[PDB]
């Protein structure tokens, strides 16, 4: 019973159109919820609500405070690669090197003479979009939380890297942790425990992959 | 009750030999548990399990989420001494200067003209093993947590500094916090509430100092 949403509705602006209308779902401990939908459906807004950045006008949200959020939009702080990944968290080599492996970063990092000690600027203009996205995801999965909110992390990644990361990181490395993935890929949806399809703030579908297949 | 392990067994590699075999212990609030053993016994692995970095194949582990971990292997991030000690933790002068004093760092820091504003590199190559170990322990004790996991912090320290740190930091500064100290020293074991002795993944002894003395 890790994440629970009951008749939840919220608005970004008072008196406006609700960004999310009567949202219901229950994600059990260690399950994978896939959040699909059209552009502007309210997917990020739903994650913003779980984070407490969006307050519901009506309904109730229940979860344990330990949340790690991966943005759609990569952000890299000034400092080394290691500084960016480990961040506020303490350093454990097994966890660090396992996360690098899972997030397809080992080859890129080893290409540099200074390895993880290479200094990045702000925004990581030196790195590629994919390298930036991988560092951002690595940082998020390196944070030890009870819930992982991954908002479209594979957006600027090639299909081959995305396949490796989804299989070895989202599915293998984070297997026992409750996680919410914003994705509209069938390839990802097949591996989901439950699927939420949003369209214009409303829940168009909620159920298993087999239930979605039967439509 | 703060930390409990009942019939806990875990493996690093599937189908291998278990790293920890049938581990049982209950550490009450504010108690000091000493974890002793031979090299390769599974001490670090036990702490890793408390962290969630090692998943048990069998058994149950219970504790409150607020954990501060001190590694066997000192790690230094690029930045100042102050930056390294307050690792993303809010700054309080009293706590800061009290932790420095307890961890025998004041004299070393005051030797530098720039004091705690001196810039360190990654791995603290500029500092001695003892200085690196002290900064790592300071960082860990500066973090306000319910449970403190101190994995062999005195390993690269001289017996005189270690005596001062154990007495004024582990025993005085952290006096009413639940602490798990990985140590094989009788001098430290006499001050422990409970003692766990590991040998090749197995619990060879579990009990009080008086019980250990009577063997």
């Amino acid at each position, epitope marked *: 019973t890790e994440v629970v949403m009951e008749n939840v509705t919220a608005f970004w602006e008072e008196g406006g159109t609700p960004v999310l209308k009567d949202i219901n779902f229950k994600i059990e401990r260690g399950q994978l919820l896939a959040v699909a939908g059209s552009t502007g459906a309210g997917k990020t807004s739903l994650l913003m609500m779980i984070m407490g950045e969006l307050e519901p006008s009506e309904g109730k949200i229940k979860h344990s405070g330990r949340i790690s959020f991966c943005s759609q939009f990569s952000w890299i702080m000034p400092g080394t690669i290691k500084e960016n990944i480990i961040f506020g968290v303490s350093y454990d080599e097994y966890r660090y*090197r396992s996360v690098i492996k899972a997030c397809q970063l*080992e080859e890129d990092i080893s290409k540099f003479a*200074e390895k993880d000690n290479i200094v990045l600027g702000e925004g990581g203009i030196t790195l590629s979009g994919g390298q930036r996205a991988r560092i951002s995801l690595a940082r998020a999965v390196y944070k030890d939380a009870d819930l992982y909110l991954l908002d479209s992390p594979f957006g600027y990644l090639d299909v081959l890297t995305e396949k490796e990361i989804f299989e070895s990181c989202v599915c293998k490395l984070m297997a026992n942790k409750t996680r919410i993935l914003v994705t509209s890929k069938m390839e990802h949806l097949k591996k989901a425990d439950k699927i939420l399809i949003l369209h214009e703030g409303s829940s168009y579908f909620y159920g298993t992959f087999s239930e979605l297949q039967n439509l | 009750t703060e930390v409990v392990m009942e019939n806990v067994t875990a493996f690093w590699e599937e189908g291998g030999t278990p790293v920890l075999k049938d581990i049982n212990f209950k550490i009450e609030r504010g108690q000091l548990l000493a974890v002793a053993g031979s090299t390769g016994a599974g001490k670090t692995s036990l702490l890793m399990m408390i962290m969630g970095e090692l998943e048990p194949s069998e058994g149950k582990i219970k504790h409150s989420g607020r954990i501060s971990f001190c590694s066997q292997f000192s790690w230094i991030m690029p930045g100042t001494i102050k930056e390294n000690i307050i690792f993303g933790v809010s700054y309080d002068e009293y706590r800061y200067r009290s932790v420095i004093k307890a961890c025998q760092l004041e004299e070393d820091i005051s030797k530098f003209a720039e004091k705690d504003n001196i810039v360190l590199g990654e791995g603290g190559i500029t500092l001695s093993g003892g200085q690196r170990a002290r900064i790592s322990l300071a960082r860990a004790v500066y973090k306000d947590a319910d449970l403190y996991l101190l994995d062999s912090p005195f390993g690269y320290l001289d017996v005189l500094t270690e005596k001062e740190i154990f007495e004024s930091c582990v025993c005085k500064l952290m006096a009413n916090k639940t602490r798990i100290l990985v140590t094989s020293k009788m001098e430290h074991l006499k001050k422990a509430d409970k003692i766990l002795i590991l040998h090749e993944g197995s619990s060879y002894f579990y009990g009080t100092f008086s019980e250990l003395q009577n063997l």
Partner: nanobody
Amino acid sequence: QVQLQESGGGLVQAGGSLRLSCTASGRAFSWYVMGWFRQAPGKEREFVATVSGNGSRRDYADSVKGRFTISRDNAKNTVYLQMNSLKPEDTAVYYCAASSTYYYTDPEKYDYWGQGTQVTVSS
């Protein structure tokens, strides 16, 4: 990316002891998983012992377990191999190697290699 040089080899009588050293010249020594490998005359390079960049993980070949000890000093950019209670089987050229990938004891995963040192254990 890292240049390795071994030392400490030579002739020893069985039951004896020998300590090998390996200094690495290059950036980010701590990133590399260091390993000791032996090549017996006519045989392939076999894994002996490995150490993670941190020094947190140490693994040994079944044959050397309990007799050999691998250690690291990241401040001195050196890796050591303490070979106690030597048998004539241990006669081989001992190589020191660095791997830029995490946790493999297979020599195929090690990119940078040293010149090697001959170790001879007389019966």
